[PDB]
Structure 1
Amino acid sequence: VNSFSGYLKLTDNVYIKNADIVEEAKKVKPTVVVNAANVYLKHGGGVAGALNKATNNAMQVESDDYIATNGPLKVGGSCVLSGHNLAKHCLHVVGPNVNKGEDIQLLKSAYENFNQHEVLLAPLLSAGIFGADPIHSLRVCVDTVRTNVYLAVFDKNLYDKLVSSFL
């Protein structure tokens, strides 16, 4: 039993809700919140910009030190950093950005990072400003993640389409 509330159950381990991941994280304070990161951990917009804003830019300051030490992430890769005031940890995961010409096949690799954590609050990877089809992202999530994932879909209209079209 966990403290996630109001989610629709899609499979044994995947759940979904129309919610703002920032507000969800503040309420639940989950062990792991997933950020929709880029390889430079530059949290400018989308989920990343919103999560960073909620940390009063502390996520960005920590991220800049991470990059200065380690260099950029790989597309499909991840790193674990602090969750600041939002969660214990933030798993920064880089899905492919179609608006940069990146290989959508890397979306499965991106979701594989979730399997290193027993329970996660997460957005749909490569959705939103990353330009991939969210119906596809949800399908890859369900077919790749085996740990317990609670998906927050910010847009109410898109949420209804994902549910009604879910196979």
Structure 2
Amino acid sequence: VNSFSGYLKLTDNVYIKNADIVEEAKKVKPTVVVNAANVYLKHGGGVAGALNKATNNAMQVESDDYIATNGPLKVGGSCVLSGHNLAKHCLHVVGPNVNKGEDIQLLKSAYENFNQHEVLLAPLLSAGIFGADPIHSLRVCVDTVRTNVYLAVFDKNLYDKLVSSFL
């Protein structure tokens, strides 16, 4: 038993809810919140901009130190950093950005990072300003992630479409 509320169950291990991941994170304090990061951990907009804003820019400060030490992530890769006031940990995962021409096949590799964590609150990778089809992203999520994932979908219209077209 865990503290996530109001989710619709899609499969044995995947759940979904129309929710703001920031507000969801502040209420649940999950062990892991997933950030839709880029390789530079520059959290300017979308989910990342919103998560970083909610941390009063502490996420960005920590991220800049991480990059200065380690260099950029790979597309499809991830790193674990602090969750600040939102979660114990933040798993920064880089899905491909279609608006940069990145290979959509790397989306499966991106979701594989979730399997290193028993439970996660997360957005749909490569959705929103990353330019992928969220229905495709949901399909890859369900077919790749084996751990328990609680997907927060900000847009109500998109949430209803995801539920209604889901196979």
TM-score interval for Structure 1 and Structure 2 normalised by the shorter chain: over 0.9
- The superposition leaves residues 38-80 of structure 1 with CA deviations (integer Å, 9 ceiling, x where unpaired) of 0000000000000000000000000000000000000000000
Unpaired stretches in structure 2, ≥5 consecutive residues: none
TM-score, normalisation: structure 2 = 1.00
| Aligned partner of residue 103 in structure 1, secondary structure | coil
Report the CA distance between 1:22 and its aligned residue. Answer: 0.1
Give distance in 2, aligned partners of 1:74 and 1:87.
24
Report the CA distance between 1:104 and its aligned residue. Answer: 0.2
Report the CA distance between 1:136 and its aligned residue. Answer: 0.1
| Aligned partner of residue 161 in structure 2, secondary structure | helix
Report the CA distance between 1:3 and its aligned residue. Answer: 0.1
In structure 1, the residue matched to 2:71 is 71
Give distance in 1, aligned partners of 2:89 and 2:78.
12
- The superposition leaves residues 68-115 of structure 1 with CA deviations (integer Å, 9 ceiling, x where unpaired) of 000000000000000000000000000000000000000000000000
Give distance in 2, aligned partners of 1:4 and 1:158.
20
- The superposition leaves residues 120-159 of structure 1 with CA deviations (integer Å, 9 ceiling, x where unpaired) of 0000000000000000000000000000000000000000
Give distance in 2, aligned partners of 1:51 and 1:134.
20
In structure 2, the residue matched to 1:123 is 123
Give distance in 1, aligned partners of 2:83 and 2:159.
25
Aligned length: 167
C-alpha RMSD of matched pairs (Å): 0.1
Give distance in 2, aligned partners of 1:161 and 1:30.
26
Report the CA distance between 1:117 and its aligned residue. Answer: 0.1
Give distance in 2, aligned partners of 1:19 and 1:106.
26
Give distance in 2, aligned partners of 1:101 and 1:138.
20
Report the CA distance between 1:9 and its aligned residue. Answer: 0.1
| Aligned partner of residue 52 in structure 1, secondary structure | helix
Query: What is the identity percentage for the equivalent residue pairs of Structure 1 and Structure 2?
Result: 100
Give distance in 2, aligned partners of 1:124 and 1:85.
22
Do residues 156 (structure 1) and 133 (structure 2) align?
Answer: no
Give distance in 2, aligned partners of 1:132 and 1:56.
28
In structure 2, the residue matched to 1:55 is 55
